[PDB]
Symmetry: C2
Subunit: 50 residues, 2 copies
């Protein structure tokens, strides 16, 4: 059933037809922007991985 | 004139009669609590001298 397996894919994922696989290992994932924060009595230390 | 020289003294200063001076040098002043702060794009670093 193509229909039920299609709904499992994420909303942001827009797939194309061809995929040129040339190896026996693939790292599928996503890139996200994490805005980390460390608060303490002394003060706050902010970080950001884009 | 005792009156005009009396008004120059601070409000918090409550003087007593006797002062036992035993040297040719005196460091008059006051003790205060300073709450310092350093803010930056990275974060805030707070200090306090009581």
């Amino acid at each position: 059933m193509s229909s039920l397996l299609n709904s499992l894919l994420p909303e942001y994922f827009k797939p194309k037809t061809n995929l040129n696989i040339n190896s026996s290992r693939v790292q599928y994932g996503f890139n996200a922007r994490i805005d980390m924060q460390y608060e303490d009595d002394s003060g706050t230390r902010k970080g950001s991985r884009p």
